[PDB]
Symmetry: C3
Subunit: 560 residues, 3 copies
Amino acid sequence: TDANFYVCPPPTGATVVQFEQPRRCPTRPEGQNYTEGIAVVFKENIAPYKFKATMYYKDVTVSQVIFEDRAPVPFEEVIDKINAKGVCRSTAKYVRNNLETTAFHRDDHETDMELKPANAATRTSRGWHTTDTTVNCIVEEVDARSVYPYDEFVLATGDFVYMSPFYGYREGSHTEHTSYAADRFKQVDGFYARDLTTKARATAPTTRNLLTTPKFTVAWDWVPKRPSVCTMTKWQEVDEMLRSEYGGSFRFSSDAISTTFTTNLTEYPLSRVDLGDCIGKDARDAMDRIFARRYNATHIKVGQPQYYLANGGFLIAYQPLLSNTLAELYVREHLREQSIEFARLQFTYNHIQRPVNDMLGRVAIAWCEEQNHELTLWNEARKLNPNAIASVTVGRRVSARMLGDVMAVSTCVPVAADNVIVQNSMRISSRPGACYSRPLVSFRYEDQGPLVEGQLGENNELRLTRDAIEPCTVGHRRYFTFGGGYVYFEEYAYSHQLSRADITTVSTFIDLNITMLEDHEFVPLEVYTRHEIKDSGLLDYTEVQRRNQLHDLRFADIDT
Amino acid sequence: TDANFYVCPPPTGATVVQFEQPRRCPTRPEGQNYTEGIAVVFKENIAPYKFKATMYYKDVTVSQVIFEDRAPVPFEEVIDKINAKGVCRSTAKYVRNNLETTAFHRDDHETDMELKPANAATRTSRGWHTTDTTVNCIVEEVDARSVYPYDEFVLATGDFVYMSPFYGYREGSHTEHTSYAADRFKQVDGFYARDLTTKARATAPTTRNLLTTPKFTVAWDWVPKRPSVCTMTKWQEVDEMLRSEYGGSFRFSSDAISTTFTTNLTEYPLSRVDLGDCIGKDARDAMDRIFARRYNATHIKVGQPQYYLANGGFLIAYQPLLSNTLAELYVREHLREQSIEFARLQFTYNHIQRPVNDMLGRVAIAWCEEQNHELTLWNEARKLNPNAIASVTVGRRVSARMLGDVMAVSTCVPVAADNVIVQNSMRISSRPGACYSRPLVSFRYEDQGPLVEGQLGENNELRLTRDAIEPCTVGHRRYFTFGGGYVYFEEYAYSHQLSRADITTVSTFIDLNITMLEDHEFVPLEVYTRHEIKDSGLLDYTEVQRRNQLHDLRFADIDT
Amino acid sequence: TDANFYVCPPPTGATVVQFEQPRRCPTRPEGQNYTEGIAVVFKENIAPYKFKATMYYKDVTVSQVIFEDRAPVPFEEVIDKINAKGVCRSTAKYVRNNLETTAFHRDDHETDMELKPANAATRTSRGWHTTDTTVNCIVEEVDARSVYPYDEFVLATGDFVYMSPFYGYREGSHTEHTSYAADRFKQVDGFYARDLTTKARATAPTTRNLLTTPKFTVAWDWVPKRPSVCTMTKWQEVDEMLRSEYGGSFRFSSDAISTTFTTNLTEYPLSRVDLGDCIGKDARDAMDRIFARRYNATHIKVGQPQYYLANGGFLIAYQPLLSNTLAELYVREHLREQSIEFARLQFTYNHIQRPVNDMLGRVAIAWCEEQNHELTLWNEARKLNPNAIASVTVGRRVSARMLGDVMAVSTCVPVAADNVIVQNSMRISSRPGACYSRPLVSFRYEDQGPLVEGQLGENNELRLTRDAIEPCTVGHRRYFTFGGGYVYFEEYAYSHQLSRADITTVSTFIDLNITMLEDHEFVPLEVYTRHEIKDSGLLDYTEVQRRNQLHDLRFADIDT
Ligand SMILES: *[C@@H]1O[C@H](CO)[C@@H](O[C@@H]2O[C@H](CO)[C@@H](O[C@@H]3O[C@H](CO)[C@@H](O)[C@H](O)[C@@H]3O)[C@H](O)[C@H]2NC(C)=O)[C@H](O)[C@H]1NC(C)=O
Ligand SMILES: *[C@@H]1O[C@H](CO)[C@@H](O[C@@H]2O[C@H](CO)[C@@H](O[C@@H]3O[C@H](CO)[C@@H](O)[C@H](O)[C@@H]3O)[C@H](O)[C@H]2NC(C)=O)[C@H](O)[C@H]1NC(C)=O
Ligand SMILES: *[C@@H]1O[C@H](CO)[C@@H](O[C@@H]2O[C@H](CO)[C@@H](O[C@@H]3O[C@H](CO)[C@@H](O)[C@H](O)[C@@H]3O)[C@H](O)[C@H]2NC(C)=O)[C@H](O)[C@H]1NC(C)=O
Ligand SMILES: *[C@@H]1O[C@H](CO)[C@@H](O[C@@H]2O[C@H](CO)[C@@H](O)[C@H](O)[C@H]2NC(C)=O)[C@H](O)[C@H]1NC(C)=O
Ligand SMILES: *[C@@H]1O[C@H](CO)[C@@H](O[C@@H]2O[C@H](CO)[C@@H](O)[C@H](O)[C@H]2NC(C)=O)[C@H](O)[C@H]1NC(C)=O
Ligand SMILES: *[C@@H]1O[C@H](CO)[C@@H](O[C@@H]2O[C@H](CO)[C@@H](O)[C@H](O)[C@H]2NC(C)=O)[C@H](O)[C@H]1NC(C)=O
Ligand SMILES: *[C@@H]1O[C@H](CO)[C@@H](O)[C@H](O)[C@H]1NC(C)=O
Ligand SMILES: *[C@@H]1O[C@H](CO)[C@@H](O)[C@H](O)[C@H]1NC(C)=O
Ligand SMILES: *[C@@H]1O[C@H](CO)[C@@H](O)[C@H](O)[C@H]1NC(C)=O
Ligand SMILES: *[C@@H]1O[C@H](CO)[C@@H](O)[C@H](O)[C@H]1NC(C)=O
Ligand SMILES: *[C@@H]1O[C@H](CO)[C@@H](O)[C@H](O)[C@H]1NC(C)=O
Ligand SMILES: *[C@@H]1O[C@H](CO)[C@@H](O)[C@H](O)[C@H]1NC(C)=O
């Protein structure tokens, strides 16, 4: 059996994800009123609303040998030519020198041209384009996403739209906010959509909205109004959380959070809002689940739960707990003063609270110390190879690229191994002494689909563009992941495909039973005569850090 | 005292070692019939057979100012000239334009030439070479390795040999398979070997085999037949393993394995083969050892052990166990129905099995989550610096290079610190403003041995070739590991050698007691006038990621 | 709220810090006489003595279009012109061709020139310089540090000084050692210092020392003699340490140390020195603190503490302990022979000591195995980004650079976010198609202070020099850390500043609730016509490892 491949596309920044940074742990435990317990953090309900928003634009170019730009298609053309006729107007209007200018298709006259589907055959959208002055009409049914405010939504392209998806005049929808002018937006009642490939017309009426941006036009199905939802939502059911009071503000820490929260020491009156039932039941049910898992036989509940707001918009519901052994000290001191009511009794005995404040302090410091050890290492790994870190962070293969100091994310298309073919000879004849460093592959997004060219990337990753090249040396021996097994390549030529069991595997951290032997460097004689380069595998950190050094000397010689 | 140095050679791919990749953990525990226990995984006995196979070949070159290649030496020359005379024939035959062609030694006539030992003085072999058209006869007693099938063996060079080492006609050895023609192989009965350095002849008869490959000739001692061995062997004595039944197949997971196994839910009848005693006793003894270590006072054995096959060829022997506290629930329910026979009683009570299925599920998910955290980080570290990861993975200093998506391995030669000398002036006078970035060293593989030139690498690593150079700046201050201590170098000049105790050490993860002060940049005045570059130490990830950016701009200027 | 920025300067090597390297763990536990306990390691008291040592030097340069060098200012000039007049002599003496040579200021005659403060406005010192042949007199009140020997001290610049700070003839100070000649050093009794900015003279007498080095002159306040101190000091209060006897030497290992110690098996007679009380009380108090924390209810003290010396100069105080359950076996065997005196009774029963020797062996091996896992990873992270590792290792933001195989350290200046301004347009008009890859910033070291130019670095780091540039592409979208939040930049133009809560955060290790969608690559049409480059974010390890490959091919074409 072979695993499914993945063709990760470059993210455009539609989804942005910052990654936690190391905090500042206390060198010595100085907190007060330490106490353990079960906590359930909640993240603000962003209310992600998704809809396939269709984008329309015209690309104008000149074959003179200039001044190419993207202009938006008008509303009448979309509803008359593209919609009622499935064609795009050959002529287009673009701004130049602060004056409207007209363009044509290959220096021709106005003629109806149909919209053909995209050749990429990707799942993003059909991406209808007419041509694979020179005007080109392109239509794409890309995806879009909105947030809880609903005043602005972002398209798959990443360009923020300053118009609410529910804006319109058909009904009393979100007509309270709009950045673009009235003429820049138009709503059609009783509109009918259709597929440009079949042109079978919509089965039922579907009102369509239209917005003309400075660079493109967008349209989508106009829904009257999405119903309300909880304003608060669960984020993580922490198994154990320690509360620390210091500087007039609590300090919450946990092992499976890697982030510390700060409150105002006052319980937030969650009951003042009607959402208390939606979150109260959800939060209360979580306490019993975690408490009944392992704390029912070793801890006692300290009063009722408590809710506190945290910096950044996080809502935390706490449930203080104390070990059974610690209860013996509290009850013993309680009986002394009298000569089980743990509520309002915690922190009463300073001497009993003195050791626990220090004992739990090391635990909090230990978690902070180890958490920073992983955070400082995880961040570097993300920068080194965000794709690998992205996949292990979202439970599935996902693309990602570093947009400076913020992480980007985009979905990867899975394709079965039966729809991919690897080129036998990876060597390229267009340039001797230089060829692709990885095997070339051909594949189809689906069974019987069109064939496309590409390159095989690391970890069964497929790259649309073939650019991984290097100065191909002699005596090259390498292996590349291909489905459930590897593919053996020697001297830049397909030798044979070997399964996963044909290569020794060091699963455990330490494995001294390897049958390794003393290797003898069999340097080919051609390198000693033709003064060429010999294979060295992928560059080591010291090697890559050394290869650039040689380059630095090359520019000095050229400059001198 | 000083530690021993290491001169790691570049691996040729003789030994290949894939490294585990992150698995896919379940977001929620959906397994059924959870149970802990002691497990002992077994790896298929590869039966590594090693033998010093002698390689013979002739390198032909032309001094015209072409068409150089490696040809194999015939059998008569090896047994008559090299063996019975310790010399190599000056003339050689090589193929050119699909026609046999003859060559000579420095445009001379046929003359007997002796074989002199190699100047490298490495432990791989003597590597006898005659010369340090132009033909050159070279003989090397390199090492070789075979696998359980024994039909094909691999030499230290890495070139696979499609001839079984036991092939021959002297006796009923492995004569059932052979890829090369009969004329390409020859066996000599009662053959006598000898050392080309002493030429004292073998002490006893030693039948020698001979194979002529398209690029070289190989010979080795012909052993009649290695005796049989166990077909199964131990790989790891897991302290704790959790079995999970899901989708009609078990799922084995452990903390010290980092890999999940899949079975068919049926116990493999290991007793059907005679090897059951060899593995049964070995496996049974391991259960008592681990059980008697920590599980004898907190767990009870659930029936007899069970053996199951796993994907990839791994054999796993399980021993289900249950905590003593959990036994109280089973016995309590057992007595209820009656109104210690844990065997065939597990999973009978669904309500009792409901919480354990979820409790143990988090443990399995926790191990999978943390295992992926290390796997995704370990893989990047291996790619960054495979030498460091290779040494910590095989318990000893070992070389390694990335052969694409598979790890290579080769042995490193240890040399005492008393046989190495460091050059005082690392600066090179052949080119101003550019010199070696690391100190140069001279050493001998053994006491009183020949002296060779080399460069000092990271972590007491010795490199045969001196290539680590960079644009030597001004005001350079650096330290390099040298034996048990460091060597101080300032302005590219040996200052003095300081022990390990002369430099502050931050052993603990966090150390705030450092006596660090505010450093003042003492930029030399020469840089402000001679517009040269100033020292900056080894490049940071952002610096190296920034240095290439400057290079990218340099090519644009050159191209423009 | 916004966090404080940090401008880390390049360390000059004044403080050097080696970092622990992976040890060699035993494949199988072979130690003898295993035992747990509380340990407190001690590091030799280095006795760091700090003093603001003022450096004086004259920079001579020639405007011919040579032979520029740094010379030391004489003693009379410092005490007469700089001290009694706050000016520097225009003329200076420098060596050339082994002959004294005179220089002038801009080819002028001798004239008094005052010393103006530095324009950097750094906390290192005022750095008075006269000019912002051509001679320039510069005075800097840099910091200095000394070690326990006190014979040599190091300045902030990093140049070691071979003269004791207490050297002199005014009293019986450290006059027993001096490397420089008598004429090279001079001490002034009853000297008076002053501030060159105010010139208000010292309030009280302050004897000043003066030393003339081959490249500069240094002066500082001469203290008679620092009082004595403890010769030993605490380093870490280990919670648990395991002692292993093997090869006639003990082997100490702990989880929070990551380093193994070796002794001579004999208790060091600490009582022979008067420091036993200073360290005995300090060490004894630590045992009770750790013992009373968690070992008072589960372990029993085995005799009195024991002190042993360790390789490298570390003093370790041990306190053997044994679990309560293990005591039942010792007392049981003790009563058998008789037919609580644990002291001198440990290791008496070989059979009872056989399992513990193996059980504790795995713990020691487990710690060594996991410790090497972090050490081998921590070292690579330090090399990758020493600044991040430096900050998390010293509890505060600190600079660091790799000086070969030794880590450098220097303090970073914190500045409030209210004293920094970010440039709106990061693009540079001096060169199209190439600009700064990070936003440019302007700031002042303090409120109302002078404004300086700089660049914004990663993790709120400020760089004095603006050099982070790259071939600016089209359709660039990136985020940069700015105070408590991020700054959004699109197409190399300041768009707006968004808080930390405006970007999704993946705090937990695995977060599958992201609202990620399928991104559609919106490639600008200008790239398809103007054949320019498209944005790709920060380079991935495979990308950077691939970018250099393209460069390698560029030099081949140029060379060919
Ligand atoms: C802890 O309590 C303090 C004090 O109440 C909280 O700060 C306060 O936050 C409120 C909003 O929650 C601020 O009110 C608003 O402030 C500005 C004008 O100052 C404006 O947006 C509105 O007109 C309104 O008045 C209030 O100013 C602010 N007070 C102070 C002194 O900063 C704080 O947020 C609480 N912390 C947590 C974690 O809940
Ligand atoms: C779990 O059980 C299944 C079903 O028995 C195993 O798959 C079976 O594996 C056997 C060999 O072990 C296959 O037999 C051979 O298959 C091909 C022809 O199909 C050929 O090599 C031989 O002539 C022989 O018949 C059998 O086809 C295959 N069955 C299926 C349905 O795939 C499977 O390996 C077991 N898994 C484990 C982990 O033990
Ligand atoms: C364990 O014990 C051995 C043996 O006593 C220690 O080695 C010895 O260390 C002393 C100094 O502590 C050495 O004495 C000095 O040696 C040289 C001349 O050899 C010179 O500096 C002085 O004149 C003085 O004699 C002694 O030679 C040395 N002995 C041996 C055999 O090496 C060792 O240091 C102890 N280990 C620990 C960890 O305490
Ligand atoms: C720890 O908790 C105790 C118990 O609530 C706090 O002690 C009370 O503090 C309030 C003022 O905050 C006083 O009016 C009460 O008399 C105190 N005692 C009791 C029994 O309530 C204590 O202040 C808390 N610690 C800190 C640092 O605030
Ligand atoms: C978990 O184990 C139990 C006990 O073996 C399984 O329950 C039996 O299932 C078989 C069929 O596989 C039935 O014939 C038996 O009657 C069941 N009960 C007993 C007491 O044997 C159960 O199927 C297992 N779980 C899964 C998911 O297969
Ligand atoms: C482990 O400790 C025991 C107890 O001290 C050592 O046994 C003693 O060894 C000395 C010599 O070193 C003998 O004179 C004693 O007779 C032994 N027994 C006792 C009760 O003291 C033992 O040698 C230690 N292990 C090792 C490897 O040295
Ligand atoms: C908690 O433990 C008590 C005491 O054994 C038991 O009666 C109760 O049912 C347990 N609760 C849960 C939810 O398991
Ligand atoms: C191979 O494994 C066995 C146990 O199966 C072990 O005893 C032996 O030492 C290992 N071989 C090497 C070379 O370490
Ligand atoms: C296991 O524990 C029992 C009960 O204490 C004891 O009798 C037995 O000897 C132990 N077995 C081993 C192998 O330690
Ligand atoms: C140095 O260590 C001591 C304990 O030995 C500690 O109290 C002190 O704070 C440390 N110094 C600094 C500057 O942190
Ligand atoms: C240690 O435990 C004993 C027994 O409970 C107790 O009497 C003693 O006070 C404890 N000592 C400390 C320092 O906590
Ligand atoms: C989002 O979180 C909820 C729990 O709050 C979980 O049930 C759901 O599966 C998550 N969504 C996805 C797409 O995984």
